């Protein structure tokens, strides 16, 4: 009956939470606390993008390192030349209200979604001179709220419907479908090897999923409110999570547990973008009052603020060779930082 | 300095540029609107009508365009989103105006609208974004008050002791009674909005029907006093 | 994407003509447009150049205040109105599609060119070998050199390598001495040094025969070289 099954769920639940328990012998605190502080990060604006006309929700750097997307309010998508502050392509989209963007890691598309539940893709290098719709995938019963690529046929997109989905570019249809979240998943990070993703949701969970086999591996639930960001350590072997609490955690794959947590009293906004650094020395995080905190990952001691933005930062980008670090927020500029 | 192609690439940067404020000019001088409301609202009989006086299975928002006065306006209602709304909310903190349609004549899913205007009125994000209040379907409540087979006295007490303020404007010829029921329910929600306003953000009644064709040059008029005092801030008057 | 330009016949000496560039299957608003031209047995030369928006004109010192280039980009073509033709106008004109943007890659379409005939500080680039022989399966490494360094401070060397099939117009081979450009065969290799460059043909088959030249793009105007032939 009902009430077996949930007693049976209950007793399921204990048993896990004591095999947590019973593998956590030393917190991470304890094992580095006896390794070199990081000391003070100064990082200066070093250039400042300019011409969006709304608020900037996302933002992606490409594997190159000097290209750069950027989803704003107006309805625009602009790459930039992070080195020369050039305007290389301006694609505007359909609908405004997007509130996601990826740069695909060959370089040839960027992806695009929000509130009108579709992850356009664009075709950047075509023969002819513009960037067109490559397809629209439709098939989301709600909002789209990140998308990444893991090739240039295939694309993983998480959504406002408690659903992560694989998609097949040249054939529109959904490959895969990840269920299991109660509440809007509002993040996703693809593991560097890119055949595993975490998803972080409004249940309070992080979920990682096994992109071939389609099913989700392990639950990770430590936090008391909705999830905003969610990025992997580039180890592949940890990822870190930044909630509406305040607080960022970083959780571990095989110890299967929550390692550290990143908070400070003075701090009472929610985070809403989470990124390491090439070393994954450092955790950079957004916040809504207006700045970014970089914390040294391994000791959860604030090594320094990156305080430029007149209205909160939404989106966090740290490049692939780990020269700079891009910020943009709500006032309408993106920031490179180093 | 920079070699021809960096010149050139500049070059085209500047383009771009130019192309942006050409796009700056129409994006701000079009106001944005987010439309609101339940199933019963006729919310959809709003945007239906106000789309044919003037000028996709699973689509998640829905637009529409019409202008007042050589004004542009544009009202999104969400289509296919889940119940939860905290956080798609988010989104329309920079809108002119909220559009918040309620049945005025129901009595058993009213409390549930007025949860859902608390809800909205005292976001964290939808401060100093003002609510522009359609109290809809006033000809059904009309009906429903005179038939007198259904109260509201047993769904809401308090409206026994209620009385009709003196500053009613029942304009058309209606009994008394149809008067106190609509001000009564216009100030269940004004007492809502007046509780923790702050100053900052107000609320528009409005008592309107589903084929009133009024509702277009209600919402510009709406719209008018929200910018004036966004731009009596702005220009340090006050 | 194609080009069609007409406009060209027999000119007496010191009259005009005007030739029309027909562009269409691109956005052409957004390119930039080079006249180049070359004279009946003759390699390659650079003309004029329009930018996208219409905002940079360039001319080669032969044709300074002779020609004037202009494009229409609502009725999508462009146009070359030339003055005083003398008799070393004599040339097959081509109208080259170039868009600038951190990785593109110039000069990638040509037209197929129009034959005008009349009656009767800047760096060199040189192709020494102006003649090869090859045979089909071994491979080939025409070379090219230069007389300023075409290395600039960006890191980028703007040498440019063409193929001129014995009948239609040059297609890009390699762009900035390293990129095959699109749908050029991973046969193709570039590299070089600053001043001297060359290009590899790694198995070379029967449609690689033709006429190879080369181009700097570091500064106006643009120079070619005469190009070596492979037979």
């Known amino acids: 009956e009902l009430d077996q099954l949930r007693q049976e769920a209950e007793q399921l639940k204990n048993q896990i939470r004591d095999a947590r328990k019973a593998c956590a012998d030393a917190t991470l605190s304890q094992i580095t606390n006896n390794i070199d502080p990081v000391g003070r990060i100064q990082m200066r604006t070093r250039r400042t993008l300019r011409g969006h006309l709304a608020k900037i929700y996302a933002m992606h750097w490409g594997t190159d390192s000097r290209l750069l997307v950027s989803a704003s309010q107006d309805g625009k998508l602009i790459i930039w030349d992070s080195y020369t502050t050039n305007k290389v392509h301006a694609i505007p989209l359909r609908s405004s209200w997007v509130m996601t963007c990826a740069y695909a890691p060959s370089g040839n598309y960027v992806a695009c979604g929000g509130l009108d539940n579709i992850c356009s893709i664009y075709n950047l290098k075509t023969r002819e001179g513009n960037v067109r719709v490559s397809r629209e995938l439709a098939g989301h019963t709600g909002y789209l709220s990140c998308c990444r690529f893991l090739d240039d046929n295939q694309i993983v997109t998480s959504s406002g419907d408690t659903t992560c989905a694989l998609w097949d570019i040249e054939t529109g249809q959904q490959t895969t479908t990840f269920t299991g979240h109660t509440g809007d998943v509002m993040s996703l990070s693809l593991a560097p090897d890119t055949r595993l993703f975490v998803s972080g949701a409004c249940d309070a969970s992080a979920k990682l999923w096994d992109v071939r086999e389609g099913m989700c591996r392990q639950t990770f639930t430590g936090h008391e409110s909705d999830i905003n960001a969610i990025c992997f350590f580039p180890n592949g072997n940890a990822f870190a999570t930044g909630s509406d609490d305040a607080t960022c955690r970083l959780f571990d794959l095989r110890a299967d547990q929550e390692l550290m947590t990143y908070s400070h009293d003075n701090i009472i906004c929610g985070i809403t973008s989470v990124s390491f650094s090439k070393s994954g020395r450092l955790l950079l995080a957004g916040y809504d009052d207006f700045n970014c905190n970089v914390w040294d990952a391994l000791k959860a001691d604030r090594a320094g603020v990156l305080a430029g933005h007149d209205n909160r930062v939404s989106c966090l980008g740290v490049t692939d060779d780990g020269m700079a670090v891009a910020t943009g927020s709500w006032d309408s500029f993106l920031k490179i930082w180093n | 300095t920079l070699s021809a192609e960096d010149k050139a690439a500049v070059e085209r940067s500047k383009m771009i540029e130019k192309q942006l404020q050409k796009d700056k000019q129409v994006y701000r001088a079009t106001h944005r609107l987010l439309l609101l409301g339940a199933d019963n609202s006729g919310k959809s009989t709003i945007v239906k009508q106000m789309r044919i006086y003037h000028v996709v299975k699973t689509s998640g928002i829905f637009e529409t365009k019409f202008q007042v006065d050589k004004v542009n306006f544009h009202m999104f209602d969400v289509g296919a989103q889940r119940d939860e709304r905290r956080k798609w909310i988010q989104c329309f903190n920079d809108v002119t105006a909220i559009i918040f349609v309620v049945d005025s004549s129901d009595y058993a899913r009213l409390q549930e609208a007025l949860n859902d205007f608390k809800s909205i009125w005292n976001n964290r994000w939808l401060r100093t974004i003002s609510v522009i209040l359609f109290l809809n379907k006033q000809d059904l409540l009309a009906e429903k008050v005179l038939a007198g087979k259904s109260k509201i006295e047993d769904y809401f007490p308090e409206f026994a002791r209620y009385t009709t303020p003196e500053d009613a404007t029942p304009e058309p010829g209606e009994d008394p009674r149809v008067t106190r029921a609509k001000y009564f329910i216009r100030d269940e929600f004004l007492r809502i909005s007046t509780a923790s306003g702050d100053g900052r953000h107000y609320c528009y009644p409005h008592f309107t029907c589903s084929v009133d064709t009024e509702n277009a040059r209600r919402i510009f008029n709406d719209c008018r006093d929200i910018i004036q005092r966004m731009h009596l801030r702005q220009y340090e008057l006050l | 994407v194609q080009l069609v330009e007409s406009g060209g016949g027999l000119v007496q000496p010191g009259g005009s003509r005007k030739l029309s560039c027909s562009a269409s299957?691109?956005?052409?608003?957004?390119?930039?447009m080079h006249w180049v031209r070359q004279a009946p047995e003759k390699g390659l030369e650079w003309v004029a150049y329009?930018?996208?928006?219409?905002?940079?004109?360039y001319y080669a010192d032969t044709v300074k205040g002779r020609f004037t280039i202009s494009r229409d980009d609502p009725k999508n073509t462009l146009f070359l109105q030339m003055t005083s033709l003398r008799s070393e106008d004599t040339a097959m004109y081509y109208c080259?599609?170039?868009?600038?943007?951190?990785?593109?890659?110039?000069?990638?379409?040509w037209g197929q060119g129009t034959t005008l005939t009349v009656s009767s500080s800047d760096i060199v680039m040189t192709q020494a070998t102006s003649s090869v022989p090859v045979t089909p399966g071994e491979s080939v490494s025409i070379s090219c050199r230069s007389s300023?360094?075409?290395?600039?401070?960006?890191?980028?060397?703007?040498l440019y390598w063409f193929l001129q099939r014995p009948g239609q117009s040059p297609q890009l081979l390699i762009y900035?001495?390293?990129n095959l450009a699109s749908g050029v065969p991973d046969r193709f290799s570039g590299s070089g040094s600053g001043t001297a460059f060359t290009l590899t043909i790694s198995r070379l088959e029967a449609e690689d025969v033709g006429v190879y030249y080369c181009?700097?793009?570091?500064?106006?105007?643009?120079?070619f070289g005469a190009g070596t032939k492979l037979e």
């Open positions: 329009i930018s996208s928006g219409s905002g940079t004109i």
């Open positions: 900035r001495m390293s």
């Open positions: 181009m700097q793009h570091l500064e106006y105007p643009l120079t």
């Open positions: 300023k360094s075409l290395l600039h401070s960006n890191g980028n060397t703007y």
């Open positions: 299957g691109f956005a052409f608003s957004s390119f930039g």
């Open positions: 080259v599609r170039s868009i600038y943007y951190y990785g593109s890659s110039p000069f990638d379409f």
